[PDB]
Amino acid sequence: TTALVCDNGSGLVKAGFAGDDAPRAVFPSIVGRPRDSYVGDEAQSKRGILTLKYPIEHGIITNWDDMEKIWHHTFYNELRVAPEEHPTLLTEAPLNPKANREKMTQIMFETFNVPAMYVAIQAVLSLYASGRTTGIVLDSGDGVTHNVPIYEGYALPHAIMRLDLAGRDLTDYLMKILTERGYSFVTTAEREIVRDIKEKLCYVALDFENEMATAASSSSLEKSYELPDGQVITIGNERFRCPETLFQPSFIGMESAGIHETTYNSIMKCDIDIRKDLYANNVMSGGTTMYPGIADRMQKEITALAPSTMKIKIIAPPERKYSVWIGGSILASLSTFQQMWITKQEYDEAGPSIVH
Amino acid sequence: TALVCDNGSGLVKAGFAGDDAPRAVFPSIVGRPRHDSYVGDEAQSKRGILTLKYPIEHGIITNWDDMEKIWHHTFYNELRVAPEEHPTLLTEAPLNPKANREKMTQIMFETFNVPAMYVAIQAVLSLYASGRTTGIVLDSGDGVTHNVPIYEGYALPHAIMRLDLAGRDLTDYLMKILTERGYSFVTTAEREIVRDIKEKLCYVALDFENEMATAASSSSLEKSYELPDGQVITIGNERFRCPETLFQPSFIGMESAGIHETTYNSIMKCDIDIRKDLYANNVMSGGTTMYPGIADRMQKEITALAPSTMKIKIIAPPERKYSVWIGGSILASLSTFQQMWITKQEYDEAGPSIVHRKC
Numbered sequence: 001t002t003a004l005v006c007d008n009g010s011g012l013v014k015a016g017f018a019g020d021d022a023p024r025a026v027f028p029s030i031v032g033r034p035r036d037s038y039v040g041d042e043a044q045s046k047r048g049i050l051t052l053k054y055p056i057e058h059g060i061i062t063n064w065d066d067m068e069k070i071w072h073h074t075f076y077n078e079l080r081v082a083p084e085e086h087p088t089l090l091t092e093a094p095l096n097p098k099a100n101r102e103k104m105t106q107i108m109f110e111t112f113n114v115p116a117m118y119v120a121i122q123a124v125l126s127l128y129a130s131g132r133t134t135g136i137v138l139d140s141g142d143g144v145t146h147n148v149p150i151y152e153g154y155a156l157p158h159a160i161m162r163l164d165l166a167g168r169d170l171t172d173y174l175m176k177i178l179t180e181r182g183y184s185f186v187t188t189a190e191r192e193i194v195r196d197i198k199e200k201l202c203y204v205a206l207d208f209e210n211e212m213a214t215a216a217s218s219s220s221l222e223k224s225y226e227l228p229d230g231q232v233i234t235i236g237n238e239r240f241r242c243p244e245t246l247f248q249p250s251f252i253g254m255e256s257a258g259i260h261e262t263t264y265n266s267i268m269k270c271d272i273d274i275r276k277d278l279y280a281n282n283v284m285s286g287g288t289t290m291y292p293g294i295a296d297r298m299q300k301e302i303t304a305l306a307p308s309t310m311k312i313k314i315i316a317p318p319e320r321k322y323s324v325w326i327g328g329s330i331l332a333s334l335s336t337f338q339q340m341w342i343t344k345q346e347y348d349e350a351g352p353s354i355v356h
Numbered sequence: 357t358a359l360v361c362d363n364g365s366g367l368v369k370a371g372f373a374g375d376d377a378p379r380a381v382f383p384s385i386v387g388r389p390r391h392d393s394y395v396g397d398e399a400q401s402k403r404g405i406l407t408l409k410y411p412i413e414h415g416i417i418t419n420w421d422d423m424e425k426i427w428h429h430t431f432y433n434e435l436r437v438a439p440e441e442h443p444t445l446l447t448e449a450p451l452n453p454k455a456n457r458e459k460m461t462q463i464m465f466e467t468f469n470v471p472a473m474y475v476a477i478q479a480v481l482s483l484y485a486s487g488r489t490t491g492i493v494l495d496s497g498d499g500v501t502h503n504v505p506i507y508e509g510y511a512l513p514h515a516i517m518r519l520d521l522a523g524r525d526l527t528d529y530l531m532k533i534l535t536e537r538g539y540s541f542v543t544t545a546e547r548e549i550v551r552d553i554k555e556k557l558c559y560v561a562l563d564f565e566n567e568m569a570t571a572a573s574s575s576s577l578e579k580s581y582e583l584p585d586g587q588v589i590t591i592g593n594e595r596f597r598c599p600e601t602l603f604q605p606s607f608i609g610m611e612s613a614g615i616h617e618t619t620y621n622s623i624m625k626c627d628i629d630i631r632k633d634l635y636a637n638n639v640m641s642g643g644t645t646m647y648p649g650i651a652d653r654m655q656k657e658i659t660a661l662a663p664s665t666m667k668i669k670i671i672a673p674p675e676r677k678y679s680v681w682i683g684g685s686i687l688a689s690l691s692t693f694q695q696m697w698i699t700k701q702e703y704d705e706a707g708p709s710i711v712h713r714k715c
């Protein structure tokens with residue numbers, strides 16, 4: 001019998017079968033209804049006759065009717081399974097309210113009649129996918145970024161840091177600067193183009209100052225991109241100014257700490273006796289950590305903040321866009337996990353509170 | 357902390373269980389005086405006043421004196437540990453003679469007085485490093501290439517294929533063909549240069565017909581390399597011709613079939629009911645699998661050879677140069693492995709024969 005793994009992203013659902021090395025289904029977490037309903041790419045394609053909503057905002061489910069349609073679509077149309085036949089592992093964001101985890105549980109057992117389920121914190125699964133149970137994850141996704149330090153398999157909630165900036169902000173920022181360069185990217189189709197430029201051409205500079213100087217004195221950092229209208233746009237410093245925002249949130253008018261500071265602060269909130277292990281096990285996950293150079297830059301920044309003898313290591317797996325999903329797939333596949341599933345029988349006896 | 361030591365024909369990879377990479381990587385060479393012993397790079401630096409010796413030829417320990425010096429240097433000079441304080445995992449080749457393993461465990465207990473040790477097959481550790489216990493491994497290293505099908509943790513000796521050709525043989529051939537086009541590569545220090553070129557510019561072309569026909573009518577494949585003597589050369593079609601040898605060994609006057617065929621054939625020597633699992637879990641490891649494009653090229657050749665609907669997957673991890681060592685580091689770190697070491701006590705109550713039953 002096959003378990004399902006569903007990572008409920010703000011932007012993209014990743015779904016599939018435990019034991020597979022990648023999610024079978026990856027699709028927009030959007031539900032469209034006429035101005036019954038559509039989900040995912042079909043909703044987006046038919047946007048001109050639908051009202052589109054995003055039931056997950058900074059990783060928290062905020063519209064349960066629409067979330068039910070995402071999950072229905074996931075089981076029946078993407079995976080082509082009957083959920084009553086499969087143990088189902090779901091993910092949640094760090095700091096997810098208790099009542100939310102209970103509602104997810106109630107829906108899974110009473111609406112979808114799953115035989116068993118489990119809910120895990122996204123960043124914890126990413127740590128597992130890197131082969132670790134102790135470490136600190138930076139998970140940067142669509143609309144939010146978290147640091148989650150983890151000890152012997154469990155997140156340490158008191159030390160979690162949340163930064164209200166992630167990939168969508170970086171896309172908006174690049175849209176703004178390319179607009180000012182004299183192109184128009186405002187609409188939804190044109191937003192997708194900018195997102196694509198960001199994902200293909202952007203990188204994190206090891207030394208932002210030096211890189212700005214290099215961009216000012218030669219064309220060595222330029223790359224070009226053909227837009228759908230046939231115009232070819234060339235960018236230079238835009239490539240690294242855009243993700244520099246992660247380190248300097250002032251670039252988009254935010255007073256927040258950057259991701260290097262939230263990482264350090266999160267480690268410093270943890271027990272002094274585990275910090276050596278945290279510093280040596282910083283794992284990066286989520287789409288907004290995909291920038292070339294991000295790991296070397298974090299290494300440099302954390303080294304400047306940490307005690308001078310401290311061993312610092314940043315792990316940025318090639319698969320880190322899907323590491324949350326992968327961690328779920330590994331976990332749900334282990335013979336030692338099979339006693340940890342919450343069963344329908346247990347739910348019938350104890351109600352939604354069992355999930356904690 | 358346990359130690360892991362992968363005894364390579366060309367390179368020793370050594371370090372601490374739990375690390376994600378070996379601390380020490382050095383040549384498997386022991387120089388005595390020509391007319392008092394040195395190992396690794398210092399033997400290479402003193403090669404002029406020392407007889408160099410390679411104690412490991414195609415993965416099989418051949419000269420136990422020299423191997424003792426390799427291990428002695430590994431503990432005391434490279435890792436700077438006292439062997440008596442660490443359980444020690446060694447690797448061995450596929451089909452290591454049974455007596456070979458023993459003498460390996462004797463030396464470990466009697467000369468270095470390790471508290472515990474274990475001996476694992478290199479290809480099997482590479483499978484573990486990919487997170488699997490079922491798959492077929494292609495391990496191409498310095499002195500040998502090997503296919504080892506593995507099922508539920510058990511390597512399958514009957515289906516193993518041993519291609520007598522690897523990294524040294526591609527290094528040797530690249531010196532032969534480079535000096536033909538114009539340049540000059542024949543000597544010991546010029547050998548270190550062409551193995552540098554091998555590891556930086558060589559690649560496996562997807563269609564060998566289309567890329568040899570591309571080079572002779574278009575300069576799109578040329579790259580420029582800086583010599584230590586202080587100059588610039590340009591290597592063209594021999595980037596991909598060098599490692600093409602792996603898929604068709606007739607290039608160096610050698611009879612037996614390529615790595616794509618030894619891979620197919622290894623699968624066919626296995627039980628028909630597991631071939632499914634082998635085809636979809638083909639793991640590549642060892643320095644000589646590092647060529648870019650080798651996974652795509654292997655993928656092409658075996659989908660053509662295997663049944664049309666068979667699901668086929670080549671796994672070539674970016675870390676595959678040290679996959680054997682990494683698999684050891686994983687294994688020796690597992691709490692579930694700790695009961696499985698052979699202790700100094702068990703060795704003193706049974707003999708060297710305990711390595712056959714406990715490993």
Ligand SMILES: Nc1ncnc2c1ncn2[C@@H]1O[C@H](COP(=O)(O)OP(=O)(O)OP(=O)(O)O)[C@@H](O)[C@H]1O
Nearest residue numbers: 009010011012059141142167168199286287288290
């Ligand atoms: N190669 C890449 N380089 C830079 N950004 C990328 C890359 N690939 C994807 N992204 C960005 O990652 C973001 C989406 O991240 P991700 O899929 O991890 O979020 P999610 O899991 O859907 O949402 P959540 O924030 O709820 O975890 C988008 O902004 C997207 O543009």
Ligand SMILES: Nc1ncnc2c1ncn2[C@@H]1O[C@H](COP(=O)(O)OP(=O)(O)OP(=O)(O)O)[C@@H](O)[C@H]1O
Nearest residue numbers: 364365366367497498499500523555642643644646
């Ligand atoms: N990046 C590279 N590209 C191609 N070949 C490489 C690369 N790096 C190393 N090699 C080659 O791989 C060989 C060494 O690999 P490896 O450490 O796996 O052999 P070994 O384990 O020492 O020997 P063996 O397992 O055959 O007994 C050398 O010939 C080396 O030149």
Ligand SMILES: [Mg+2]
Nearest residue numbers: 009122141286
């Ligand atoms: Mg996410």
Ligand SMILES: [Mg+2]
Nearest residue numbers: 184185190229
């Ligand atoms: Mg327009």
Ligand SMILES: [Mg+2]
Nearest residue numbers: 364478497680
């Ligand atoms: Mg080897």
